[PDB]
């Protein structure tokens, strides 16, 4: 179950998508995010992505709809997770480093302290090596 701190973190993630701060994520904003993460969805693809999440059918994603998606996470999806992993593991060595995570967050327009980046890595790190491997990443997502 979600906690206060975790809901507040998902709200911060939502604000990285909601570029114009109007409280909804549009296809355009989703496209911007996806491209900043190295993906190249078409217009129709973006519409399909929003449609999966858009509970009230208004064509945009509000925070309760975003949180509804995040709450459930993934369940028993393989290939999308490897693609997401590769977004972060830009050198391809199989480990997400704090520098790699910070670079991603900077491309999304989030400026974080070193403490904050380390805290993020710590939350997903299981073995304590200070990096996130794929098995760790899968467990975070599911
Ligand atoms: C076509 C296939 C698409 C698969 C790629 C999906 C890309 C996933 C992008 C995930 C973005 C994550 C960031 O928004 C979060 N790490 C933000 O963390 P925050 O909670 O603000 O700290
Ligand atoms: C704290 C961590 C924040 C992580 C935010 C993750 C976002 C990813 O799930 C992205 N794939 C963006 O999702 P969105 O574009 O809102 O909708 C995905 C559509 N789909 C359900 C059909 C995959
Ligand atoms: C369908 C597949 C797409 C799902 C991608 C989901 C993206 C979520 C962010 C990916 C996480 C990568 C890890 O290296 C770290 N970002 C873990 O961050 P996290 O622990 O989720 O951040 C929460 C904020 N906090 C750490 C400060 C608590
Ligand atoms: Ca917006
Ligand atoms: Ca909506
Ligand atoms: Ca790496
Ligand atoms: Ca690790």
Curated annotation (Swiss-Prot):
Modified residues (N6-acetyllysine): 19, 90
Glycyl lysine isopeptide (Lys-Gly) (interchain with G-Cter in SUMO2) crosslink residues: 19
Modified residues (Phosphoserine): 77, 97
Chief site of localization: cytoplasm
Protein keywords: Acetylation, Calcium, Cytoplasm, Cytoskeleton, Isopeptide bond, Metal-binding, Methylation, Phosphoprotein, Repeat, Ubl conjugation
Positions annotated to bind Ca(2+) 3: 89, 91, 93, 95, 100
UniProt-listed Pfam families: EF-hand_7 (PF13499)
GO cellular component, one term: cytoplasm
UniProt: Ca(2+) 1 binding residues: 18, 20, 22, 24, 29
Modified residues (N6,N6,N6-trimethyllysine): 111
GO MF entries: calcium ion binding; protein domain specific binding
Any Gene Ontology biological process: regulation of release of sequestered calcium ion into cytosol by sarcoplasmic reticulum
Binding site for Ca(2+) 2: 54, 56, 58, 60, 65
Modified residues (N6-methyllysine): 111
Phosphothreonine PTM sites in chain numbering: 42, 106
Other information: This protein has four functional calcium-binding sites.
Notes on the domains: The N-terminal and C-terminal lobes of CALM bind to the C-terminus of KCNQ1 in a clamp-like conformation. Binding of CALM C-terminus to KCNQ1 is calcium-independent but is essential for assembly of the structure. Binding of CALM N-terminus to KCNQ1 is calcium-dependent and regulates electrophysiological activity of the channel. The C-lobe interacts with KCNN4 channels in a calcium-independent manner, whereas the N-lobe interacts with the S4-S5 linker of KCNN4 in a calcium-dependent manner playing a role as calcium sensor and gating the channel.
Quaternary context: Homotetramer. Interacts with CEP97, CCP110, TTN/titin and SRY. Interacts with MYO5A and RRAD. Interacts with USP6; the interaction is calcium dependent. Interacts with CDK5RAP2. Interacts with SCN5A. Interacts with RYR1 and RYR2. Interacts with FCHO1. Interacts with MIP in a 1:2 stoichiometry; the interaction with the cytoplasmic domains from two MIP subunits promotes MIP water channel closure. Interacts with ORAI1; this may play a role in the regulation of ORAI1-mediated calcium transport. Interacts with SYT7. Interacts with MYO10 and MYO1C.
Family to which the UniProt record says this protein belongs: Belongs to the calmodulin family.
Protein name, UniProt field: Calmodulin
Organism the protein comes from: Bos taurus
Phylogenetic classification of the source organism: Eukaryota, Metazoa, Chordata, Craniata, Vertebrata
Gene: CALM
